[PDB]
């Protein structure tokens, strides 16, 4: 506990002392690039899709989204997207590599001009660790 | 994330003996027992009992770092007496003391009406 450090009762931490919820929200648009080129929400197939993420795409339902409730982890693909140009490059959204958790909620919408866009919430519970500031 | 599994505190590792008895170089008839997956609970208990043994010249234990559940216990005895035997006797004495403690608590508890 020297030089501004402190000791925590690991017993208390287990009992719920200082735990917290954590929610991050990932967004993605289905953009329209002119008269012909349109991005798509789907599960990319590795044969006809370039520059795929090394992460896994299995947690995607055929609409290109993970259903809420699935547990995720680093580098995994939350939102599947392709930007057709010619067959098509991979424009998917992976979960931050330094994080993990369970998907809390996933919503599908259109905006002011009607571009399909989807928001994904991810919930983790952060339990007080060592370099944690108080 | 860099957090070790909680069972690592008590559950022995792959090919890891509870005891590792190494001999002390610096002193005659002295030894160093490393106790894996153990803490103060046992260390201070044993050390204090070896102190009661008259034929025991030196006894001390230390938890070299708190991230690891292990402790080094150093035993030095008079010539002819073996430190492993010293440890064996102190271990036994402790058990026999606890045996009486249980018996005595049990008897006293049974007398209570609450």
């Amino acid at each position: 506990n020297q030089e501004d450090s402190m000791i925590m009762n690991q017993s208390s931490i287990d009992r719920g002392l200082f735990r917290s919820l954590f929610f991050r929200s990932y967004m993605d648009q289905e953009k329209k690039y002119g008269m012909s080129i349109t991005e798509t929400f789907e599960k990319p197939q590795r044969t006809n899709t370039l520059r795929m993420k090394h992460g896994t795409y299995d947690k995607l339902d055929d609409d290109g989204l993970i259903a809420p409730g699935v547990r995720v982890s680093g580098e995994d693909v939350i939102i599947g997207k392709t930007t057709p140009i010619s067959s098509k490059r991979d424009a998917s959204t992976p979960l931050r590599s330094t994080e993990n958790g369970i998907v809390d909620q996933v919503l599908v919408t259109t905006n002011q001009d009607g571009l399909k866009f989807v928001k994904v919430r991810v919930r983790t519970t952060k339990i007080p660790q060592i370099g944690d500031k108080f | 994330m860099n957090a070790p599994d909680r069972f690592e505190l008590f559950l022995l590792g792959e090919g890891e003996s509870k005891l590792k008895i190494d001999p002390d170089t610096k002193a005659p008839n002295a030894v160093v027992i490393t106790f894996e997956k153990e803490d103060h609970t046992l260390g201070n208990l044993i050390r204090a009992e070896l102190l009661n043994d008259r034929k025991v010249l030196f006894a001390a234990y230390k938890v070299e770092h708190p991230f690891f559940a292990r402790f080094k216990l150093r035993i030095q005895t008079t010539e002819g007496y073996d430190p492993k035997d010293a440890l064996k006797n102190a271990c036994n004495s402790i058990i026999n003391k606890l045996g009486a403690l249980k018996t005595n608590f049990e008897t006293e508890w049974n007398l209570q009406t609450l």
Binding site: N9, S11, S12, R15, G16, L17 | -
Partner: protein, 65 residues
């Protein structure tokens, strides 16, 4: 939000005592310090658990879905 089961410091179950405490205050008019003590919460670690709780859940329930 929502009464902690077990006091953080010693782990005495405090999960059952909530409604009982809130009752000893409305129904019995009793002051906080006596109600806590009635409920057998003697150590201040246990006392602080109930005494300083904010049951936010009750607001959370006010939203429809």
């Amino acid at each position: 939000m929502i009464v902690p089961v077990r006091c953080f410091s010693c782990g005495k179950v405090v999960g059952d005592k909530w409604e009982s405490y809130l009752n000893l205050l409305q129904e019995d008019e009793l002051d906080e310090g006596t109600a806590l003590s009635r409920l057998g919460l003697k150590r201040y670690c246990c006392r602080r658990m109930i005494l300083t709780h904010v049951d936010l859940i009750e607001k959370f329930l006010r939203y429809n879905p």
